[PDB]
């Protein structure tokens, strides 16, 4: 219930919401159904629209009009944004030569540049290029400020998700806008586009920036506003609160555009109608920065320009039905469209079974348009599990597809051209950024970067302390010209042990067989060298990664790889080595396939044993340094230790074996030697961070050695490939992944066809960033490069994503 007899009199786009039921004047009382009576009349004004005409210049003021062009209207701070223009011979914003701003040049009383956020729903990336010749606002800023060719947006790339990451840093599973359509069943509660629930605070989670401003004494813009209120009225509004007494004045705003979003779906990402909507983003684009010029905040503000998601071309016709898979259709609950949500329509129905749900989707048409996954087996790099809002079961829908329940819920609700969605490495859906100001760089292009690190950026442009997120606060420090966030290293918890030769082989009871009975000093000082680190240098080339745990490992040296050995998991944390350009790939001999040799250095009782593998008849074993890239004969033997041995399923030795045999000589051949770190990741509660022991679900049976959910690799090279990886004098190229460890190849619907057909395309869709697999190992790597630690900041957020233009 809301007293509308009230009055927003003096109150227009207040900026503190006031409680009910009194009536509200802020920019969201439309979307309350809360205005006072009077809002419409005071607060909307439209008398004689936007501009000022020759005729109009020194007028008379008239409260009614929706903006003025009266001698006082500067001092008031409601011009019409071309009011000089018109009536004081200056030029448009867009008309003047882009000057360098090397310092904020404010009015007196301004403590602080302010930040304006303007946010663009559905702006594709390629609008930038594709769309020039009709946003000349837009290309000043791009082409004068600093800008990436693209912005990456986070899974699912739907407004509300987006939006929120923006304002938060965190991943959606940590928000908990999950997606546009959620059910939350702790509350028993659903949040809909339409409907009252979403307006409760109970599903906003972590500190959105407006709060992180207002905590630390900086005041904020409301950021959102009704649909109804017209985007000149939110420029004007925004121009009015700027002219406010500096006590008063808020420091950062935001400006949202439903366009051009809104027209994609019904034209398509290119339709031809989609020339208008650019054209008109752009001239509230000329709106804002004349606005700015009339006050002389143009030299004094930062403008971010910022998308949330692309746009794809979609049609009802690119509809599969779960009707055409399942029996039992009407027992399941689909959240639909460009991703799948799956759950039971009864928590009363003991029949349900997910398994026999995930079996009836997977690999039935030759053509299949989706892919089904426990959320577990989800890529890592989407960090699209940990929350009670995405349900067990998800559906990744190939670009331009959709999947519903059911024809009926298709034309029973063709329209629609275009939707959104989508895995977040698509093409289609990558967004933009553009940073234009005193602390943003001139004439700079950056590098294409995740939305997660802008919360933080952001915060460096407030001087405001970021709340905890998933940014990678120093990763986006190019982009600044000051306010550069300068981060320490973490320090190291544990440190490692360095094991001599301790043990006798008879000592070891493992069950384990090997025929290395082989028996000279030039080559007895040698192996002795390469024990103690003689080659180090060579294959450990950005120093050892750090430990960031409490743990008990040991550095274990050989002639083609260095490890640290996990005493308490049984097997390495990583493996590192070196192959170069010129590396020749031999076999895993017959006299060897079966060898695995009791390491001397490293104690029976902190070993892994062949008798389990043996036993267990799921499991088997595979190797962490591959025996085929092996120096030597002599030194193949190193390879077959039982501290270089990781728990393998023979699904996924088929994968771990094409990789080491093939890829890493592929990759050392195309981009001049690579460095590779490998190692396993437990996962065991998909919550992207490394589990500790009494998290470990599975082990190999009758043992302690505890079963990898993933495997990782970061493999690195020299930027400049005219640099073999080992001699790289300048800035570092990366790729890496964090492959699932399954049972089965069931995610790979050709995996009966030779691995040359499948496993490439399995290792694409597993990329990751280095920072992923930190978080998931809890080392940190590149600890000793001579490169500044914000470079390799970005190298640690980089993706290699696999998509052509
Ligand atoms: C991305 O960045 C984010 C932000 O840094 C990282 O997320 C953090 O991760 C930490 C580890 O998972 C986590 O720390 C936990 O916090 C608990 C206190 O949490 C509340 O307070 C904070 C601070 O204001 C608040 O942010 C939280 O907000 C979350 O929860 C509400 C749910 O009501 C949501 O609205 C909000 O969206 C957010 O949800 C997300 O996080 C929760 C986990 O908190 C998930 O379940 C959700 O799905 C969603 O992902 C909270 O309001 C604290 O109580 C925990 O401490 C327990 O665990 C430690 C382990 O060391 C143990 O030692 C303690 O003793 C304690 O154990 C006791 O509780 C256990 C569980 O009930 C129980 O088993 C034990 O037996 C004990 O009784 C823990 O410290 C931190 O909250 C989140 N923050 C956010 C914002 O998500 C994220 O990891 C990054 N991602 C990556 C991949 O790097
Ligand atoms: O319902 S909508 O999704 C959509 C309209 O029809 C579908 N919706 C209405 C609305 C109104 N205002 C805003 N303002 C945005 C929120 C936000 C978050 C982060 C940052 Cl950095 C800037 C901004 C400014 N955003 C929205 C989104
Ligand atoms: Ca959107
Ligand atoms: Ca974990
Ligand atoms: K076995
Ligand atoms: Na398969
Ligand atoms: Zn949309």
């Given at each position: 219930?809301?007293?509308?007899?009230?009055?927003?009199?003096?109150?227009?786009?207040?900026?503190?919401?006031?409680?009910?039921?009194?009536?509200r004047?802020?920019?969201?009382?439309?979307?309350?159904?809360?205005?006072?009576?009077?809002?419409?009349?005071?607060?909307?004004?439209?008398?004689?629209?936007?501009?000022?005409?020759?005729?109009?210049?020194?007028?008379?003021?008239?409260?009614?009009?929706?903006?003025?062009?009266?001698?006082?209207?500067?001092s008031?701070?409601?011009?019409?944004?071309?009011?000089?223009?018109?009536?004081?011979?200056?030029?448009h914003?867009?008309?003047?030569?882009?000057?360098?701003?090397?310092?904020?040049?404010?009015?007196?009383?301004?403590?602080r540049?302010?930040?304006?956020?303007?946010?663009?729903?559905?702006?594709?990336?390629?609008?930038?290029?594709?769309?020039?010749?009709?946003?000349?606002?837009?290309?000043?800023?791009?082409?004068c400020?600093?800008?990436?060719?693209?912005?990456?947006?986070?899974?699912?790339?739907?407004?509300?998700?987006?939006?929120?990451?923006?304002?938060?840093?965190?991943?959606?599973?940590?928000?908990?806008?999950?997606?546009?359509?959620?059910?939350?069943?702790?509350?028993?509660?659903?949040?809909?586009?339409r409907?009252?629930?979403?307006?409760?605070?109970?599903?906003?989670?972590?500190?959105?920036?407006?709060?992180?401003?207002?905590?630390?004494?900086?005041?904020?813009?409301?950021?959102?506003?009704?649909?109804?209120?017209?985007?000149?009225?939110?420029?004007?509004?925004?121009?009015?609160?700027?002219?406010?007494?500096?006590?008063?004045?808020?420091?950062?705003?935001?400006?949202?555009?439903?366009?051009?979003?809104?027209?994609?779906?019904?034209?398509?990402?290119?339709?031809?109608?989609?020339?208008?909507?650019?054209?008109?983003?752009?001239?509230?684009?000329?709106?804002l920065?004349?606005?700015?010029?009339?006050?002389?905040?143009?030299?004094?503000?930062?403008?971010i320009?910022?998308?949330?998601?692309?746009?794809?071309d979609?049609?009802?016709?690119?509809?599969?039905?779960?009707?055409?898979?399942?029996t039992?259709?009407?027992?399941?609950?689909?959240?639909?469209?460009?991703?799948?949500?799956?759950?039971?329509?009864?928590?009363?129905?003991?029949?349900?079974?997910?398994?026999?749900?995930?079996?009836?989707?997977?690999?039935?048409?030759?053509?299949?348009?989706?892919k089904?996954?426990?959320?577990?087996?989800?890529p890592?790099?989407?960090?699209?599990?940990?929350?009670r809002?995405?349900?067990?079961?998800?559906?990744?829908?190939?670009?331009?597809?959709?999947?519903?329940?059911?024809?009926?819920?298709?034309?029973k609700?063709?329209?629609?051209?275009?939707?959104?969605?989508?895995?977040?490495?698509?093409?289609?859906?990558?967004?933009?950024?553009?940073?234009?100001?005193?602390?943003?760089?001139?004439?700079?292009?950056?590098?294409?970067?995740?939305?997660?690190?802008?919360?933080?950026?952001?915060?460096?442009?407030?001087?405001?302390?970021?709340?905890?997120?998933?940014?990678?606060?120093?990763?986006?420090?190019?982009?600044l010209?000051?306010?550069?966030?300068?981060?320490?290293?973490?320090?190291?918890?544990?440190?490692?042990?360095?094991?001599?030769?301790?043990?006798?082989?008879?000592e070891?009871?493992?069950?384990?067989?090997?025929?290395?009975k082989?028996?000279?000093?030039?080559?007895?000082?040698?192996?002795r060298?390469?024990?103690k680190?003689?080659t180090?240098?060579?294959?450990?080339?950005?120093?050892?990664?750090?430990?960031?745990?409490?743990?008990?490992?040991?550095?274990?040296?050989?002639?083609?790889?260095?490890?640290?050995?996990?005493?308490?998991?049984?097997?390495?944390?990583?493996?590192?080595?070196?192959?170069?350009?010129?590396?020749?790939?031999?076999?895993?001999?017959?006299?060897?396939?079966?060898?695995?040799?009791p390491?001397?250095?490293?104690s029976?009782?902190?070993?892994?044993?062949?008798?389990?593998?043996?036993?267990?008849?799921?499991?088997?074993?595979?190797?962490?340094?591959?025996?085929?890239?092996?120096?030597?004969?002599?030194?193949?033997?190193?390879?077959?230790?039982?501290?270089?041995?990781?728990?393998?399923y023979?699904?996924?030795?088929?994968?771990?074996?094409?990789?080491?045999?093939?890829?890493?000589?592929?990759?050392?051949?195309?981009?001049?030697?690579?460095?590779?770190?490998?190692?396993?990741?437990?996962?065991?509660?998909?919550?992207?961070?490394?589990?500790?022991?009494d998290?470990?679900?599975?082990?190999?049976?009758?043992?302690?050695?505890?079963?990898?959910?993933?495997?990782?690799?970061?493999?690195?090279?020299?930027?400049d490939?005219?640099?073999?990886?080992?001699?790289?004098?300048?800035?570092?190229?990366?790729?890496?992944?964090?492959?699932?460890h399954?049972?089965?190849?069931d995610?790979?619907?050709?995996?009966?066809?030779?691995?040359?057909?499948?496993?490439?395309?399995?290792?694409?869709?597993?990329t990751a960033?280095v920072?992923?697999?930190?978080?998931?190992?809890?080392?940190?790597?590149?600890?000793?490069?001579?490169?500044?630690?914000?470079?390799?900041?970005?190298?640690?957020?980089y993706?290699?994503?696999?998509?052509?233009?």
């Amino acid at each position: 219930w809301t007293a509308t007899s009230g009055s927003c009199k003096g109150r227009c786009f207040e900026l503190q919401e006031v409680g009910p039921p009194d009536c509200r004047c802020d920019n969201l009382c439309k979307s309350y159904s809360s205005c006072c009576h009077d809002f419409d009349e005071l607060c909307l004004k439209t008398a004689r629209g936007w501009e000022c005409t020759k005729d109009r210049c020194g007028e008379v003021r008239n409260e009614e009009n929706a903006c003025h062009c009266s001698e006082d209207c500067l001092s008031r701070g409601d011009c019409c944004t071309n009011y000089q223009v018109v009536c004081k011979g200056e030029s448009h914003w867009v008309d003047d030569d882009c000057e360098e701003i090397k310092v904020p040049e404010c009015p007196a009383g301004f403590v602080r540049p302010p930040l304006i956020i303007f946010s663009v729903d559905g702006f594709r990336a390629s609008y930038m290029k594709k769309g020039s010749k009709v946003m000349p606002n837009i290309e000043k800023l791009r082409s004068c400020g600093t800008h990436a060719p693209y912005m990456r947006p986070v899974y699912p790339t739907k407004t509300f998700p987006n939006l929120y990451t923006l304002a938060t840093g965190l991943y959606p599973e940590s928000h908990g806008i999950v997606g546009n359509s959620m059910y939350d069943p702790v509350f028993d509660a659903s949040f809909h586009l339409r409907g009252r629930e979403k307006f409760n605070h109970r599903w906003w989670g972590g500190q959105p920036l407006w709060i992180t401003a207002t905590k630390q004494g900086v005041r904020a813009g409301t950021f959102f506003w009704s649909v109804s209120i017209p985007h000149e009225r939110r420029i004007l509004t925004i121009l009015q609160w700027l002219s406010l007494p500096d006590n008063e004045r808020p420091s950062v705003y935001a400006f949202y555009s439903e366009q051009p979003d809104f027209s994609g779906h019904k034209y398509g990402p290119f339709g031809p109608e989609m020339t208008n909507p650019l054209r008109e983003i752009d001239k509230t684009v000329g709106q804002l920065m004349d606005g700015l010029k009339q006050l002389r905040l143009h030299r004094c503000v930062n403008v971010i320009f910022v998308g949330d998601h692309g746009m794809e071309d979609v049609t009802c016709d690119r509809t599969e039905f779960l009707s055409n898979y399942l029996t039992n259709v009407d027992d399941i609950t689909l959240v639909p469209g460009t991703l799948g949500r799956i759950r039971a329509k009864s928590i009363n129905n003991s029949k349900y079974d997910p398994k026999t749900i995930i079996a009836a989707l997977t690999c039935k048409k030759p053509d299949q348009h989706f892919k089904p996954y426990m959320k577990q087996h989800l890529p890592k790099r989407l960090h699209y599990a940990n929350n009670r809002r995405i349900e067990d079961i998800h559906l990744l829908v190939d670009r331009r597809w959709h999947v519903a329940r059911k024809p009926l819920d298709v034309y029973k609700k063709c329209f629609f051209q275009g939707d959104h969605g989508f895995d977040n490495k698509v093409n289609s859906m990558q967004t933009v950024f553009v940073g234009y100001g005193p602390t943003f760089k001139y004439r700079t292009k950056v590098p294409p970067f995740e939305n997660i690190e802008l919360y933080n950026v952001m915060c460096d442009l407030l001087g405001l302390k970021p709340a905890p997120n998933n940014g990678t606060h120093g990763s986006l420090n190019h982009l600044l010209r000051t306010n550069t966030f300068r981060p320490t290293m973490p320090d190291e918890v544990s440190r490692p042990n360095y094991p001599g030769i301790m043990y006798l082989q008879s000592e070891f009871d493992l069950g384990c067989t090997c025929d290395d009975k082989v028996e000279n000093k030039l080559e007895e000082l040698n192996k002795r060298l390469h024990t103690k680190g003689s080659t180090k240098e060579r294959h450990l080339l950005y120093g050892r990664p750090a430990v960031l745990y409490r743990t008990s490992y040991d550095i274990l040296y050989h002639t083609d790889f260095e490890s640290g050995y996990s005493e308490i998991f049984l097997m390495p944390l990583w493996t590192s080595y070196t192959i170069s350009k010129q590396a020749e790939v031999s076999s895993i001999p017959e006299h060897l396939t079966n060898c695995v040799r009791p390491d001397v250095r490293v104690s029976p009782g902190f070993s892994q044993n062949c008798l389990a593998y043996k036993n267990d008849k799921q499991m088997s074993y595979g190797f962490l340094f591959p025996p085929y890239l092996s120096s030597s004969p002599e030194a193949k033997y190193d390879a077959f230790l039982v501290t270089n041995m990781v728990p393998m399923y023979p699904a996924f030795k088929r994968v771990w074996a094409y990789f080491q045999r093939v890829l890493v000589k592929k990759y050392a051949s195309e981009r001049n030697g690579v460095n590779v770190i490998s190692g396993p990741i437990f996962d065991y509660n998909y919550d992207g961070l490394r589990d500790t022991e009494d998290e470990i679900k599975q082990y190999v049976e009758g043992s302690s050695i505890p079963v990898p959910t993933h495997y990782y690799s970061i493999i690195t090279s020299c930027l400049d490939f005219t640099q073999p990886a080992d001699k790289c004098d300048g800035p570092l190229s990366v790729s890496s992944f964090i492959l699932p460890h399954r049972p089965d190849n069931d995610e790979s619907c050709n995996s009966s066809e030779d691995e040359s057909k499948w496993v490439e395309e399995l290792m694409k869709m597993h990329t990751a960033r280095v920072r992923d697999i930190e978080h998931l190992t809890g080392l940190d790597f590149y600890r000793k490069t001579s490169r500044s630690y914000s470079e390799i900041l970005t190298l640690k957020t980089y993706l290699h994503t696999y998509e052509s233009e």
